[PDB]
């Protein structure tokens, strides 16, 4: 029931919103995972690993280049906006709203969200392999060598780019090789962030799960913290709930969420 939720919503002083791949999906962003989510011959699991980066750094960067470029045509959907505006609106009133997102596309930032935690990092940040500096980067193309590369059709030629022409650290005493600042499979989440997210989720008196379920990573790491405090949790996704069952609003977040937050 929406009414029930809204009664909580109106009372809430510290809302936490966890967002999953669903909300990026409704903006037409490919995640490259599961049925027909392919890039060339590969899926994300095959390429989003440090081993792939070690074995074939050109190929991986081609993949991330493409992904960076396809963001130029994908915009924030109404779910991103409603969240951002909600944040803005509640901040005015001394009520907080934080976003904890698994998504690496910056769509919440482009919707105008401010207190956002990117637990898997971002396509538009680099980390230097030598010195470790994390820098914001939105260049198009990120480096010349990759101009016009990264085509998806399975039959494309590899650009087989020499390693020194892929993006390189600018602090030139260094010149290290850059990688996408994202958490690859088989890597850990940065623990400074998890400690901040912990702190937020404890403060929180309403929790939203959007475009994913609490019964699965990453929402699962935390929703129990919050549910064991008696805090209500509301899921918005396109998963079905059995005939026989805290709050769950089936449908697109684009449709469900903005009415809910108004």
């Amino acid at each position: 029931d929406l009414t029930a939720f809204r009664e909580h919503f109106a009372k809430a002083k510290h809302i936490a919103i966890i967002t999953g791949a669903g909300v990026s999906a409704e903006s037409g962003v490919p995640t490259f995972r599961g049925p027909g989510g392919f890039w060339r011959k590969w899926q994300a699991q095959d390429l989003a690993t440090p081993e792939a980066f070690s074995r074939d750094p050109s190929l991986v960067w081609e993949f991330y280049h493409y992904r960076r470029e396809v963001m130029r045509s994908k915009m924030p959907n109404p779910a991103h906006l409603a969240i951002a505006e909600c944040e803005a609106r509640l901040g005015q009133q001394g009520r907080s709203v934080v976003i904890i997102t698994q998504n690496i596309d910056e769509l919440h930032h482009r919707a105008g969200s401010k207190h956002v935690y990117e637990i898997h990092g971002s396509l538009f940040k680099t980390r230097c392999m030598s010195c470790g500096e994390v820098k914001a980067n939105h260049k198009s193309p990120i480096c010349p060598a990759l101009d016009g590369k990264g085509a998806p059709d399975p039959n494309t030629k590899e650009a087989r780019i020499p390693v020194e022409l892929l993006p390189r650290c600018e602090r030139k005493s260094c010149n290290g090789l850059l990688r996408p600042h994202v958490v690859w499979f088989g890597e850990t989440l940065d623990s400074d962030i998890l400690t901040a997210v912990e702190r937020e989720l404890e403060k929180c008196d309403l929790c939203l799960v959007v475009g994913t379920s609490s019964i699965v990573y990453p929402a699962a790491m935390f929703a129990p913290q919050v549910a064991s405090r008696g805090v209500p949790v509301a899921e918005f996704n396109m998963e079905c709930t059995p005939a026989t069952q805290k709050y769950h609003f089936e449908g697109p977040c684009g449709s469900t969420l903005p009415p809910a937050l108004e």
């Binding site: 890597e187 850990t188 990573y217």
Partner: peptide, 8 residues
């Protein structure tokens, strides 16, 4: 540290 997707 927390393995992404719990290492699945």
């Amino acid at each position: 540290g927390v393995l992404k997707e719990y290492g699945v």
